Scaffold this active site. Structure first.
Site, PDB file in Angstrom:
ATOM      1  N   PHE A 187      -7.893  -7.016   3.857  1.00 35.38           N
ATOM      2  CA  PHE A 187      -7.576  -5.611   4.081  1.00 35.38           C
ATOM      3  C   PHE A 187      -7.901  -4.811   2.830  1.00 35.38           C
ATOM      4  O   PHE A 187      -8.405  -3.720   2.839  1.00 35.38           O
ATOM      5  CB  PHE A 187      -6.077  -5.511   4.376  1.00 35.38           C
ATOM      6  CG  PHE A 187      -5.593  -4.125   4.736  1.00 35.38           C
ATOM      7  CD1 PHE A 187      -5.220  -3.203   3.762  1.00 35.38           C
ATOM      8  CD2 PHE A 187      -5.356  -3.790   6.067  1.00 35.38           C
ATOM      9  CE1 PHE A 187      -4.693  -1.948   4.112  1.00 35.38           C
ATOM     10  CE2 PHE A 187      -4.834  -2.548   6.433  1.00 35.38           C
ATOM     11  CZ  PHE A 187      -4.496  -1.616   5.450  1.00 35.38           C
ATOM     12  N   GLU A 195       0.778  -1.232   0.000  1.00 34.53           N
ATOM     13  CA  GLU A 195       0.000   0.000   0.000  1.00 34.53           C
ATOM     14  C   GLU A 195       0.814   1.289   0.000  1.00 34.53           C
ATOM     15  O   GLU A 195       0.287   2.353  -0.280  1.00 34.53           O
ATOM     16  CB  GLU A 195      -0.830   0.001   1.297  1.00 34.53           C
ATOM     17  CG  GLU A 195      -1.789  -1.182   1.379  1.00 34.53           C
ATOM     18  CD  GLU A 195      -2.998  -1.088   0.481  1.00 34.53           C
ATOM     19  OE1 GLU A 195      -3.793  -1.989   0.360  1.00 34.53           O
ATOM     20  OE2 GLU A 195      -3.176   0.079  -0.095  1.00 34.53           O
ATOM     21  N   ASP A 229      -7.097   6.306  -4.185  1.00 35.33           N
ATOM     22  CA  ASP A 229      -6.542   4.971  -4.365  1.00 35.33           C
ATOM     23  C   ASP A 229      -6.713   4.533  -5.826  1.00 35.33           C
ATOM     24  O   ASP A 229      -7.111   5.320  -6.649  1.00 35.33           O
ATOM     25  CB  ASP A 229      -7.114   3.971  -3.327  1.00 35.33           C
ATOM     26  CG  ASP A 229      -8.571   3.576  -3.469  1.00 35.33           C
ATOM     27  OD1 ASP A 229      -9.148   2.861  -2.687  1.00 35.33           O
ATOM     28  OD2 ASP A 229      -9.145   4.027  -4.540  1.00 35.33           O
TER      29      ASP A 229
END
Ligand SMILES: [Cl-]
Ligand SMILES: [Cl-]
Length: 164
Positions: A104, A11, A20
């Protein structure tokens, strides 16, 4: 290598609000703020998450604290999910990390949807699960990242992350 290091690689770390891969407002280590198209709503969620008036910028310590919480939540969501729990219980430590990574990234609900792949992992049919996992929007939209988790499930080692 461990889950934290693994996800930090996947990430990255950004201390200002950013978009994102899907265009959603996020901050820190992949901490999703909101799916709403409004920067304000994002700023409001940020303030609420940190506990202060941030103005879209946080510190490294703050980033890490959200990260710890997020990892904890991922694990908890897995253990609470009737479809995920049994899979996770059946896996070795390295592969467990790959399952956390997927949750996640896509949420418990999302992962719980990979029914067939899940059954295959539970059965320990590695190559077959890897092929099935690849037939997904997830792999098609973020191929390099998906590939890293898929390889992890296939080999049970951290080889996809060694160099990174
Ligand atoms: Cl939060
Ligand atoms: Cl990617």
């Amino acid at each position: 290598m461990n889950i934290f290091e693994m996800l930090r690689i996947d990430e990255g770390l950004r201390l200002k609000i950013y978009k994102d891969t899907e265009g959603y407002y996020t901050i820190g280590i992949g901490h999703l703020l909101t799916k709403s198209p409004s920067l304000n709503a994002a700023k409001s969620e940020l303030d609420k998450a940190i506990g202060r008036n941030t103005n879209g910028v946080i510190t490294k310590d703050e980033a890490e604290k959200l990260f710890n919480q997020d990892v904890d939540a991922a694990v908890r969501g897995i253990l609470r999910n009737a479809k995920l729990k049994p899979v996770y219980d059946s896996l070795d430590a390295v592969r467990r990390a790959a399952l956390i990574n997927m949750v996640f990234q896509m949420g418990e609900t999302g992962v719980a949807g990979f029914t067939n792949s899940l059954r295959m992992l539970q059965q320990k049919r590695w190559d077959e699960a890897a092929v099935n996992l690849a037939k997904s929007r997830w792999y098609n939209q973020t191929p390099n990242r998906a590939k890293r988790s898929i390889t992890t499930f296939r080999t049970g080692t951290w080889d996809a992350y060694k160099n990174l």
